[PDB]
Amino acid sequence: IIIATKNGKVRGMQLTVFGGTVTAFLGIPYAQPPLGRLRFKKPQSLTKWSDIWNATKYANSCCQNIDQSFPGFHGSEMWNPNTDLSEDCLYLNVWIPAPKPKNATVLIWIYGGGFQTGTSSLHVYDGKFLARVERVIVVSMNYRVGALGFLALPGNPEAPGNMGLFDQQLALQWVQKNIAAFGGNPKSVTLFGESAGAASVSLHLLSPGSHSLFTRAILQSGSFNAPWAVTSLYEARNRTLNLAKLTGCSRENETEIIKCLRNKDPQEILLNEAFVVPYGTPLSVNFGPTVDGDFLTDMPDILLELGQFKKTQILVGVNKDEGTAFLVYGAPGFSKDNNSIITRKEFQEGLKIFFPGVSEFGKESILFHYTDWVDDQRPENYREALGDVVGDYNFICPALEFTKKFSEWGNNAFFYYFEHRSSKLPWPEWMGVMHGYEIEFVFGLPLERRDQYTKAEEILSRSIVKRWANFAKYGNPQETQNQSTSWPVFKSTEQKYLTLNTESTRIMTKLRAQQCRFWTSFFPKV
Ligand SMILES: *[C@@H]1O[C@H](CO[C@@H]2O[C@@H](C)[C@@H](O)[C@@H](O)[C@@H]2O)[C@@H](O[C@@H]2O[C@H](CO)[C@@H](O)[C@H](O)[C@H]2NC(C)=O)[C@H](O)[C@H]1NC(C)=O
Ligand SMILES: *[C@@H]1O[C@H](CO[C@@H]2O[C@@H](C)[C@@H](O)[C@@H](O)[C@@H]2O)[C@@H](O[C@@H]2O[C@H](CO)[C@@H](O)[C@H](O)[C@H]2NC(C)=O)[C@H](O)[C@H]1NC(C)=O
Ligand SMILES: *[C@@H]1O[C@H](CO[C@@H]2O[C@@H](C)[C@@H](O)[C@@H](O)[C@@H]2O)[C@@H](O[C@@H]2O[C@H](CO)[C@@H](O)[C@H](O)[C@H]2NC(C)=O)[C@H](O)[C@H]1NC(C)=O
Ligand SMILES: CCCCN(CCc1c[nH]c2cc(O)ccc12)CCC1CCCCCC1
Ligand SMILES: *[C@@H]1O[C@H](CO[C@@H]2O[C@@H](C)[C@@H](O)[C@@H](O)[C@@H]2O)[C@@H](O)[C@H](O)[C@H]1NC(C)=O
Ligand SMILES: *[C@@H]1O[C@H](CO[C@@H]2O[C@@H](C)[C@@H](O)[C@@H](O)[C@@H]2O)[C@@H](O)[C@H](O)[C@H]1NC(C)=O
Ligand SMILES: CC(=O)N[C@H]1[C@H]([C@H](O)[C@H](O)CO)O[C@@](O)(C(=O)O)C[C@@H]1O
Ligand SMILES: *[C@@H]1O[C@H](CO)[C@@H](O)[C@H](O)[C@H]1NC(C)=O
């Protein structure tokens, strides 16, 4: 029940899972609380304790704005924090199999939420099923988001940028120094994450300070080359100065600006985050990763292109309808409570919401590439086109381009296309296989027979859980026993990928080839 770590003793709790037992340590601190003079700085190392730390409940979630667009709707609210918000939020969780394993592979989860939201305590990130079923150890951590996690004045240690990424890194360090005491193998650590969590994972593959802290990496619906994932040196500064003006903290000594922002309540910083950009989108990452000269040494597109990253296996993938979820947070004519049949004029209006600073010619060129109908009378034509536009530009094409470029330097890569709509999904049917709704299958929630999922979904989750676990243990995401479809490596020539669904697993080639040539090779010139 009690494990001695390098900083002190922690006490866990016993969980009953599938007629078996998992030991959970919820809320182990891994850094000095970033409070007071520590706000905005890199995370500081934690001093020893002599008592027994009780890690039996999830800790505080990091300060963040909350989705209030659909009060009382489980579809949006399941992503809102489920513990108190506090700047005192640098804690992590460990699920170990019972009985204590001897040398278990470790899976470290990094949540998404656009670098502005998210928390490790969410129900769909419960690691107890992976521990029970595959005998891996699951670790997840809270990291700072929003301006408190990524405010940037490059070079200035009072606010150097990328603090949230350094939080994640200090947690990976904790796993290296401490996980053997829990039965884990620090030499067999697989990072996995979704959305901004996946972008984070892709940046740890790029940061030299993370290279000895993990073995392999899994990227679900995200990567650093997505247009939302990296704030520019220019933008970050305009945004830092705009936040200072909004809080009455405009000063000339840049350090006295930070000092002034350190006497503001967290609530005042959160209220003004939305407005630092003149035109935002539903996908807007107001404060995100930057080229800080510490975590990130050069612009990441250049490092990817020139082979400057950790050489290892990656598992990458995306969902069939990445884009649809964002259409009901601003696009005109849309609603989760009707079928959202939009006109051509509403389509064009929607491009202005999602591409606010793009030229007229650029928006016409999107319209031209996505409105060459196979049938011009289908009334859902424009509704589906805008979802595909948003998903292809923001997620699917950047992930495919990351996988091609990474694989060109000789490592095995595996690419999946998730296309199952959860039978319990509370969003309407027109949004399809939504952004974020593979996560519960990865974490094995359908394996609980009590949870109203179908048995076909139990089989799909069971197979995904095995493939993920085999990837982390052996570099190879196969299911070798139940006559499953073999997952081939993704090579830059043939570009084979595997489809994940309840009907038939299939091998296909060159996903969204025609679409991604537009986004990756033409649209960057506009
Ligand atoms: C626990 O296992 C490690 C080996 O981990 C494996 O090898 C990694 C390279 C990676 O592929 C993981 O996914 C694997 O599971 C043992 O490491 C050995 O330690 C001895 C120390 O005497 C060293 O001489 C060997 O070179 C190491 N082997 C490798 C392959 O690096 C470790 O000893 C095991 N510890 C316990 C307590 O079981
Ligand atoms: C860079 O910053 C300036 C300043 O932004 C303004 O102040 C902030 C506190 C915030 O409330 C913003 O929404 C404000 O607009 C931006 O300049 C503004 O641009 C808008 C339209 O682009 C214009 O209507 C305002 O009058 C401008 N205000 C000032 C003081 O210049 C600017 O657009 C930002 N971005 C770029 C790329 O320059
Ligand atoms: C689908 O609904 C949108 C959103 O309208 C709101 O939500 C509905 C479910 C309903 O309760 C409405 O009363 C709400 O206002 C509709 O878009 C609106 O259309 C009106 C024209 O009647 C327009 O003035 C508003 O600006 C629109 N609102 C937005 C956010 O675009 C849309 O017409 C509905 N489409 C279908 C096919 O039913
Ligand atoms: C201005 C409105 C922002 C609302 N947002 C929430 C915060 C956010 C901003 N930008 C992002 C980018 C991402 O990849 C993921 C989340 C976010 C989208 C909410 C969705 C969560 C993810 C799964 C779909 C269901 C609703
Ligand atoms: C830490 O926890 C200690 C033991 O917890 C108690 O015993 C177990 C079996 C559970 O039933 C649990 O709910 C009980 O509370 C406490 O004795 C100790 O006071 C705790 N320390 C602090 C600082 O709260
Ligand atoms: C594999 O299947 C198990 C149950 O299926 C039975 O066993 C296999 C080996 C075949 O003989 C089949 O005809 C039987 O019905 C599941 O319990 C197990 O979880 C499955 N494993 C994975 C990774 O999906
Ligand atoms: C506010 C509102 O009218 N909600 C309606 C919901 C949602 O619109 C969808 O589940 C998508 O969110 O759909 C129902 O058909 C349903 O699922 O039983 C009935 C209900 O009236
Ligand atoms: C800004 O203030 C800090 C703290 O008082 C001081 O160390 C620094 O030298 C000042 N810089 C300038 C340019 O005034």
From Swiss-Prot:
Gene3D superfamilies xref list: alpha/beta hydrolase (3.40.50.1820)
Outcome recorded upon mutating residue 96 to M: Does not affect enzyme activity
Tissue specificity field: Detected in blood plasma (at protein level). Present in most cells except erythrocytes.
Effect annotated for changing residue 72 to R: In BCHED; reduced enzyme activity
Alphabetized UniProt keyword annotations: Disease variant, Disulfide bond, Glycoprotein, Hydrolase, Phosphoprotein, Secreted, Serine esterase, Sialic acid, Signal
Effect of mutating residue 467 to W: Does not affect enzymatic activity
Residues annotated as glycosylated: 14, 54, 103, 238, 253, 338, 452, 478, 482-483
Known outcome of mutating residue 122 to F: In BCHED; seems to cause reduced expression of the protein
Reported modifications of this chain: N-glycosylated. No other PTM detected. The major N-glycan structures are of the complex diantennary type with 1 and 2 N-acetylneuraminic acid molecules (Neu5Ac) making up approximately 33% and 47% of the total N-glycans, respectively. Only low amounts of fucosylated diantennary N-glycans are detected (approximately 2%). Triantennary N-glycans with or without fucose amount to approximately 13%, whereas 5% of the total N-glycans are of the oligomannosidic or hybrid type.
Gene Ontology MF: a single term: enzyme binding
Phenotype upon changing residue 330 to C: In BCHED; results in 20% of activity compared to wild-type
Keyword Glycoprotein belongs to the record: yes
Outcome of mutating residue 291 to M: Does not affect enzymatic activity
InterPro entries the UniProt entry points to: AB_hydrolase_fold, AChE-related_enzymes, AChE_tetra, CarbesteraseB, Carboxylesterase_B_AS, Carboxylesterase_B_CS, Cholinesterase
Gene Ontology biological process terms, A to Z: acetylcholine catabolic process; choline metabolic process; cocaine metabolic process; learning; negative regulation of cell population proliferation; negative regulation of synaptic transmission; neuroblast differentiation; peptide hormone processing
Binding site for tacrine: 79, 435
An annotated GO cellular component: endoplasmic reticulum lumen
Activity regulation statement: Inhibited by mercury. Inhibited by Tabun. Tabun forms a covalent adduct with Ser-195 that becomes irreversible upon aging.
Cystine bridges: 62-89, 249-260, 397-516
Catalytic residues (UniProt): 195 (acyl-ester intermediate), 322 (charge relay system), 435 (charge relay system)
Function: Esterase with broad substrate specificity. Contributes to the inactivation of the neurotransmitter acetylcholine. Can degrade neurotoxic organophosphate esters.
Record's subunit section: Homotetramer; disulfide-linked. Dimer of dimers.
Disease involvement: Butyrylcholinesterase deficiency: An autosomal recessive metabolic condition characterized by increased sensitivity to certain anesthetic drugs, including the muscle relaxants succinylcholine or mivacurium. BCHED results in slower hydrolysis of these drugs and, consequently, a prolonged neuromuscular block, leading to apnea. The duration of the prolonged apnea varies significantly depending on the extent of the enzyme deficiency.
Similarity annotation: Belongs to the type-B carboxylesterase/lipase family.
The protein, known as: Cholinesterase
Organism expressing this protein natively: Homo sapiens
